[PDB]
Design a protein around this ligand. Structure first.
Ligand code: M43
Ligand SMILES: C[C@@H](OP(=O)(O)O)[C@H](NC(=O)CCCCCCS)C(=O)O
Ligand SMILES: O=S(=O)(O)CCS
Ligand SMILES: O=S(=O)(O)CCS
Ligand SMILES: [Ca+2]
Ligand SMILES: [Cl-]
Lengths: 278, 431, 578, 578, 48
């Protein structure tokens, strides 16, 4: 597939994170039981609750779709539906909220992702969501400074960073060691855990610039319009085709008075410097 | 324009069907489905009997002491049912129908089409008027007691404009609760529809899209060339035209993701010549255009529904549908540089329904939405059928499920052949 | 008059007029207009108006009797609050001039009842989460911080100044005594304690209530007065949904915004909610929780008389009447549906001078006489048209005779509208006490009106007898919009939808029948319990007393004022007083 | 940022944060929670809660951060009112804590416009009665006694206390200069005086208005604030009906209640009335004159900025925005349609810190740049998608860069929803200034939001972009409920009906296009004139300044308080202070 | 660009206003929301 448009490394990051054929780099290896601790829907070693009998010991509606779509393992077992939630700093988080949903719904079977500015939640059957949490906490989409596991009190994505480059957390779920190592000392909703969970050191600024999916005209990020005109070129095109269609769905752009001459524009001028500070 | 119609198992039902043949304005099956939808009431006589005996004859949390009467309506169920039928009849052999169900605990009422002169809400009123006189006459209720019967049957009406606390239950609502002229057939909860097709997803989507598109006509949205786009959406998304819908689900149902369906749909659109290169961007990315935008929209809407079915059926749960529709639209746009289903309106409704199914502010799970709902009304017919599909697929993971909210409809409306097999009904009539 | 002065009009008439209550003549044109004692407020108003004109940029004029109708060519009479010894100025009964009246209706408007059991069932069904009396206690504590406008989850939230919203809080009640014992008592509205009233033994009322409610838990939530005042009644169920929503997230450690949150919204806003009233047909477009959609029975259940005076069905009528006169006539018909000077006396006639009090106590006496001294004994096989007609004609003659033989009483009730209302209310009362049944009270209403026109040759204002002429027909009708049990009616019941001088009485009759029937409520056991809440500003047990305090400006219970956040008032200049 | 600090965000950022505006780092966890300056109100609120608990019968708890979310792990920041030097506490922007915001909306709600010409026509047709400037002058004098609750016909009427209703009066306006000259000037709202503003010469705005209005006579009547607060907006047209009804009877010597009186009712309540808004579909059931039915253009026309600063289309935008944020977001979405802590900062983001101010002035600059320095020149054959796209992409990059380059700005606008609202408003302003046309502002809105999601990887809250994804489609649609001109939209336009962070900006865009277009109003010449009335309590020409005074409790113009008729307040014990 | 103006002229204030009465098409009957109950359709017709 094409996935998305864009000519810059940020656009390629987007395409990779969306691409199931692309294997995401692993930065850490959090043990499953520590994952369970962090989510705090259950205690490690505790058996999965059921909201209904396993599908196999049940007669389903005579539905063609149920017939041809395999349930996930969590669904087959009748697991509860629980969730994992991340907050992504505007300061070059490796992945951004919208791209999380693109990633999730391309890569995973049977998920319910929701995108907001300061939180992205994914819901799925409990055992399924535990597996997704590990994958997403382990890999390059989670930075221990610019990403946070937060099921409530998410404030901070747009707040300035602290001295060490950590994103603000009002519940203080994390603790930072002298060597930069980040440990979670509370669960993802700020509850007490029986033990601390080490996540690891933050990526460097250069690495963050390299890995991020955001365009950001500050602190050396990619300047969308100056560095990647293709990006808005194609987004604008979508915009105008929706515009024409709402008026008359059958209409072609060429039949419109003052319609676009082409994709893109000839005379876009910018009114900020690179890095924006003046 | 021509399409082939296929059933929920990928088997062809009709070929070379002119697009007009499945129009709500012309298809006898659709017209019948509409007619049944406004005429057919369901009554829980056992519960009504209990209302009278306990004085619980008003609204929620209300009880009137001292007006308890024991009226053997379930006992005399056969007499009541016949009195009603005779009152509803306008002429012998007409389409009047009344049936007792579950040993007379429950009753179906269908006033004849002829009693509806102007106002579709006669389906409710004729039944309510007939039922209360039936009870009074059959159970020999005295003048003094007559008003309690009115309350049992009509609820809080007229003090409350909504007779919802009363005895006769319809799929549709009273005219006042409709959000605009022509919204009549939109005011039908997803859970009621899901119950009605007995939780078979494609029948639910189909039935729901047949009602939505009929409403679209009634709203005035299908005049002139605008019509074609709606008929294409209905045929492809709702009726599995040329097996695109079933095919997308079948091909991805084992280990496919939502994105997989979307991309498979883009590739089919290309193969079928629906979309073609417009311009190649510096990165190599190709923006596509479509000579026939309405047809592309039909293909996109089908992609949308198929993506919803695949993901929700994987989870065997309904809650994913709004976020599914959102990324379906978003991703199909990013893949092609063309506009998503209903030119952005479907994505819009997916945002609001995502919000109002995961927040404190209103809505609920998908089963409490419907085409008339302020949250989900925005798309021009293509959106709500996905919801019904999702709540059919739901394995009772949700609290407000059709089993909880809509059992009565499943039981009473479930055996109506046009409701049970809407696609075959349409395909037959389109021949 | 009634034999006992605590209920007859003889003290009011005596203290209002110089001459005897049965006097047939008086003196006019010699009071000096508003120079007289009853012109005191109007003098006060003239003095104010001058300062108002001074502050206007082009000196647009304001209150000026000379530009209108100057008052007091006759005696400007004071009024006595029913079953009180409190005299008030006529002007001080206008709802605008009376903060107690305003609070009584704001208290009703800002209430919402919400089931809790559905929430517990949802927690269990979807999450398997434990619900205990301790979690419920914690839930209610969080709720009582959140509901008035306190933050429970987010950082950097603004919050409400508590003294601006100090009338907002939440309690729970339940028919399950064992659950009530287990929950922190600070959150309990206790049915056993508010309803220890009985007829044959202590706590019968509580018994009736707990049986009807069963082992269920219900919340009563009161939103801030200032919220009702700034917005409307439609805010209330929504406000509950929001803050119960926030509380649930906190109390049960959920995601702050997951699928379960969404179902909690539907639970709180639709599935388990109990409102004061639904909306109106759009000609009279109104939000939820407004007077237009509030049934008569709910008005009655909002009063505490039946719990405080279990053996006094007529006090229960008159207290319900006083709330209803003010809500339905002064506010709803006199403002919401019209405005201006409004309908103060159309209303106050039913709660002043002990005149309606007199008729209704006599009516009950007559009803009992005809019931062989057995209250509420006329029903079933004993209910017939003959004995009703007999009861009605007897009371109707007693009441209409009072206005004729004691002309001060008619001078007080100077418009035939309130005379009709009151005579009919008395007749309805007689039938109430006789039968313990509301619906037959309508037969008494119809017959009283028709008999009144027939006897006196006049009735009420131009359009007074719309519903009265409809009453016989709608009495026992079961047609679509024409029939309804009395308790369930209101001002959306079609022929009730326009006129003063009726609903006041109706609220009484509905209360009368059920108090005489020894019923602990009229329509809603849930609203009955909620309104017993002793933390409400306005005293729902002593309604006419509260009105009297408000009239004389001695009322200390108004909520929702903004004095704490302003430096002055519009049209009033700041700076120290000499 | 914008070159001129009077409109840029640099003074606000400088005065809010210790670090530089472009700083990327700060310090957390060291403020002592609410011990910090910005915790002052919360400490105040804690001290009050204790008293509230002490007053309750079972000690039901109230405000308690420890039972919710304690505040201030981060800096609790103050805000600067847009285009002022007024700093405020965040807590003081909540509508409940701010009497100026309350008065702003009450003033709008209590207004009704009513033509007089039809009444004269009726007087002539049925009675052959002469109408002269003198009789009109007498009529207005009587009306100004009657409207607030004074009697004009009947004896023994109760009346309202003028200081409780001192904000109620009526004026007339007309395009007929000779009629205006002839009428008693005390009753005139003078168009030539309130609209002396012009562009190429004095009085052009007046000219526009008088041409649109013509030789007609219109009344603006304001009802008492306390009436809005006790009841709802549905009262308003009815109240005008009643008191205009009574005035007609007096001023024209009619029978007090004949057939002509009936036709006067229909004339007043239907035939010639102009309301603020119509009712709502019943899910969100509401009376007339509430925010749900009020079009955006009326919101805009209610501000005075265009008559006070005719060459400053962005000030017009930002003043309309300030009214709209508070009305649509804080009150309507944040209360009428939800409640609780609500939506203070969703709103205040658009009227504080000069952030939206900065974007919109830069926007106008960019749009003018593309319009060759000729404001409003991009119309007709010059109007195309290419130039729009160039304008929108330029300004969108400008505004989104500000949040990224000056992180204090993002920290102030911490929720993506307000960043989106403001970037999009900036784009809309750019198009408004270039085109002088509202509809194309929608094209900028759509592209800005889509460009935002695309650039940043995120946008607003969970359901922020419902209307935004619909925007392109609804742009130029003509389908039933899907299309309509921007000016006429409001929160009953379907996809507009649920969400914060839009209607604020929209009110601005609709004003900007028109001020740039040298139009004296947006939608309604009648409401434009009415709201120019300088006797209104809230200053509709200096909105953000008023909000600032309300915040700091320095506001002196609140109406409708009841301090004059009470001896105390609920929850506050009487007795002298020590 | 001009299409929305045509909508305004024909549909009135609808949908912002539930009532399209300001619009161009005049019927004897009204919109369903303004009926005072189910079955009232044919009654919503002014005597004049
Ligand atoms: C200026 S802007 C701002 C405003 C504000 C806010 N809100 Ni919210 N909410 C509310 C509203 C708010 C506002 C305020 C103002 O000021 O305006 C309110 C306030 C409502 C009421 N109830 O009142 C509330 C709160 C309060 C407390 O805390 O309690 C609730 C809760 C909730 N809602 C829902 O539904 C869901 C929820 C829960 C949730 C939670 C969260 C956490 O956890 O933290 C959430 N949400 C999420 C979110 C978000 C979204 C996105 O992201 O975009 C956001 C935030 C972010 C950060 O960073 O901070 C937001 C916001 C914003 O934005 N939100
Ligand atoms: C959707 C609908 O809720 P229901 O689905 O009917 O519960 C609607 N709420 C409002 O849209 C909430 C708007 C304000 C809160 C959200 C702010 S973004 C209402 O109560 O009428
Ligand atoms: O119009 S009437 O004269 O009938 C009475 C209104 S108070
Ligand atoms: O539900 S959301 O978290 O999107 C925001 C509502 S404030
Ligand atoms: Ca109010
Ligand atoms: Cl005049």
């Amino acid at each position: 597939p094409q996935f998305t448009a864009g000519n810059s490394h940020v656009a390629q990051n987007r395409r990779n994170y969306m691409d199931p054929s692309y294997k995401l780099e692993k930065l850490r290896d959090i043990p499953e039981e520590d994952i369970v601790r962090l989510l705090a829907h259950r205690a490690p070693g505790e058996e999965y609750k059921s909201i209904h009998p396993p599908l196999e010991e049940m007669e389903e509606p005579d539905c063609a779709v149920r017939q041809i779509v395999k349930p996930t393992e969590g669904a087959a077992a009748g697991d509860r539906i629980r969730y994992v939630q991340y907050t992504d700093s505007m300061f070059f988080s490796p992945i951004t909220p919208y791209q999380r949903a693109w990633e999730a719904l391309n890569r995973y079977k049977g998920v319910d992702p929701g995108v907001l500015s300061g939180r992205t939640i994914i819901e799925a059957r409990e055992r399924d969501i535990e597996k997704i949490a590990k994958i997403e906490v382990d890999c390059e989409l989670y930075d221990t400074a610019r990403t946070g596991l937060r099921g409530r009190t998410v404030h901070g994505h747009a707040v300035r960073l602290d001295k060490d480059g950590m994103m603000f957390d009002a519940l203080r779920r994390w603790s930072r060691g002298a060597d930069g190592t980040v440990t979670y000392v509370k669960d993802m909703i700020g509850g007490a855990m029986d033990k601390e969970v080490t996540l690891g050191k933050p990526l460097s600024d250069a690495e963050l610039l390299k890995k991020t999916t955001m365009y950001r005209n500050a602190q050396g990020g990619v300047w969308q319009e100056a560095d990647d005109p293709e990006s808005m070129d194609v987004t604008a095109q979508i915009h105008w085709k929706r515009s024409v269609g709402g008026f008359q769905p059958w209409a072609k752009m060429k039949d419109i008075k003052g319609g676009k001459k082409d994709v893109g524009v000839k005379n876009l001028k910018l009114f900020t410097p690179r890095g924006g500070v003046e | 324009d021509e399409i082939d119609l296929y059933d929920d198992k990928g088997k062809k039902l009709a070929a070379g069907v002119p697009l007009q043949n499945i129009s709500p304005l012309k298809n006898a099956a659709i017209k019948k489905i509409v007619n049944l939808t406004i005429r057919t009431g369901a009554v829980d006589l056992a519960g009504l009997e209990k209302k009278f005996a306990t004085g619980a004859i008003a609204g929620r949390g209300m009880v009137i002491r001292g007006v308890n009467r024991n009226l053997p309506i379930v006992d005399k169920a056969k007499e009541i049912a016949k009195a009603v039928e005779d009152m509803l009849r306008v002429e012998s052999g007409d389409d009047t129908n009344v049936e007792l169900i579950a040993g007379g605990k429950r009753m179906m009422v269908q006033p004849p089409t002829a009693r509806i002169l102007s106002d579709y809400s006669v389906g409710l009123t004729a039944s309510m008027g007939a039922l209360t006189h039936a009870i009074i006459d059959v159970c020999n209720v005295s003048m003094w007691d007559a008003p309690y019967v009115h309350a049992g049957v009509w609820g809080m009406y007229p003090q409350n404009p909504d007779p919802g606390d009363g005895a006769v239950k319809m799929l549709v609502d009273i005219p006042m609760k409709n959000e605009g002229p022509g919204f009549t057939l939109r005011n039908i909860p997803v859970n009621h529809l899901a119950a009605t097709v007995r939780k078979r997803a494609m029948q639910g989507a189909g039935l729901t899209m047949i009602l939505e598109e009929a409403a679209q006509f009634e709203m005035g949205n299908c005049m002139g060339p605008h019509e074609r786009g709606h008929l294409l959406d209905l045929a492809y998304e709702g009726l599995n035209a040329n097996n695109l819908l079933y095919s997308l689900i079948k091909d991805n149902g084992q280990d496919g993701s939502l994105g997989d369906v979307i991309y498979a749909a883009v590739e089919k659109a290309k193969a079928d010549g629906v979309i073609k290169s417009l311009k190649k961007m510096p990165s190599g990315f190709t923006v596509y255009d479509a000579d026939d935008m309405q047809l592309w929209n039909a293909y996109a809407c089908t992609a949308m529904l198929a993506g919803v079915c695949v993901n929700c059926a994987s989870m065997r749960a309904g809650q994913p549908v709004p976020g599914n529709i959102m990324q379906a639209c978003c991703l199909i746009e990013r893949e092609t540089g063309l506009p998503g289903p209903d030119f952005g309106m479907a994505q819009g409704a997916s945002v609001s329904s995502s919000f109002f199914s995961h927040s404190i502010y209103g809505g609920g799970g998908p089963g409490v939405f419907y085409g008339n709902h302020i949250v989900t009304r925005h798309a021009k017919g293509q959106f709500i059928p996905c919801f019904c599909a999702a709540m059919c697929i739901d394995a009772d993971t949700m609290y407000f499920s059709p089993a909880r909210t809509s059992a009565l409809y499943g039981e009473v409306l479930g055996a109506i052949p046009e409701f049970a097999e809407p696609m075959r009904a349409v395909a037959e009539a389109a021949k | 008059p009634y034999n006992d002065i605590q209920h007859n009009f003889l003290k009011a008439m005596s203290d209002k007029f110089a001459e005897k209550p049965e006097s047939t003549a008086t003196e006019f044109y010699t009071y000096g207009g508003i120079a007289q004692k009853g012109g005191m407020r109007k003098r006060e108003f003239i003095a104010e108006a001058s300062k108002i004109v001074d502050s206007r940029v082009n000196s647009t004029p304001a209150y000026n009797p000379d530009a209108g109708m100057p008052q007091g060519q006759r005696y400007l009479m004071p009024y006595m609050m029913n079953h009180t010894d409190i005299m008030v100025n006529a002007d001080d009964l206008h709802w605008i001039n009376n903060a107690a009246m305003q609070q009584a209706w704001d208290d009703m408007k800002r209430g919402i009842v919400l089931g809790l059991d559905d929430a517990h069932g949802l927690l269990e069904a979807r999450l398997g989460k434990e619900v205990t009396p301790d979690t419920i206690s914690n839930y209610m504590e969080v709720l009582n911080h959140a509901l008035p406008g306190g933050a429970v989850i987010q950082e950097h939230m603004v919050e409400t100044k508590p003294m601006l919203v100090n009338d907002s809080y939440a309690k729970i009640f339940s028919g399950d005594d064992d659950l009530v014992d287990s929950v922190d008592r600070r959150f309990i509205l206790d049915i056993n304690k508010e309803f220890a009233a009985g007829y044959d033994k202590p706590g019968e009322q509580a018994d009736q209530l707990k049986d009807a409610i069963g082992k269920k838990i219900w919340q009563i939530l009161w939103m801030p007065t200032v919220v009702a005042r700034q917005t409307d009644g439609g805010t209330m169920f929504r406000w509950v949904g929001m803050q119960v929503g926030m509380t649930m997230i906190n109390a049960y450690k959920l995601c702050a915004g997951e699928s379960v949150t969404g179902e909690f919204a539907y639970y709180a806003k639709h599935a388990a909610v109990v409102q004061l009233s639904n909306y109106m047909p759009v000609k009279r477009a109104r939000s939820h929780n407004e007077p237009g959609g509030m049934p008569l029975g709910i008005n009655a259940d909002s009063t505490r008389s039946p719990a405080l005076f279990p053996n006094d069905p007529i006090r229960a009528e008159l207290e319900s009447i006083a709330v209803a006169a003010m809500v339905y006539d002064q506010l709803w018909f006199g403002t919401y549906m019209s405005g201006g000077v409004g309908f103060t006396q159309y209303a106050s006639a039913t709660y002043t001078d002990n005149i309606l009090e007199d008729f209704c106590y006599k009516g009950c006496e007559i009803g009992l006489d005809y019931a062989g001294g057995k209250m509420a004994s006329i029903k079933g096989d004993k209910l017939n048209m003959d004995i009703l007609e007999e009861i009605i004609r007897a009371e109707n003659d007693y009441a209409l005779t009072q206005y004729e033989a004691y002309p001060t009483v008619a001078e007080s009730h100077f418009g035939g509208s309130v005379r009709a209302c009151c005579a009919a209310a008395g007749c309805g009362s007689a039938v109430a006490c006789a039968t313990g049944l509301a619906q037959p009270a309508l037969s008494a209403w119809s017959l009283s009106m028709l008999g009144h026109y027939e006897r006196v040759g006049r009735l009420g204002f131009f359009g007074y007898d719309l519903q009265d002429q409809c009453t016989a027909c709608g009495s026992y009708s079961y047609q679509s919009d024409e029939g309804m049990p009395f308790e369930m009616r209101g001002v959306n019941y079609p022929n009730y939808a326009m006129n003063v001088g009726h609903q006041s009485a109706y609220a009484g009759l509905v209360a009368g029948a059920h108090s005489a029937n020894h019923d602990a409520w009229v329509l809603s056991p849930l609203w009955k319990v909620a309104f017993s809440d002793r933390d409400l500003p306005f005293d729902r047990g002593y309604v006419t007393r509260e009105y009297g305090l408000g009239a004389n400006r001695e009322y200390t219970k108004v909520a929702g004022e903004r004095d704490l956040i302003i430096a002055g008032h519009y049209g009033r200049e700041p700076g120290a007083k000499l």
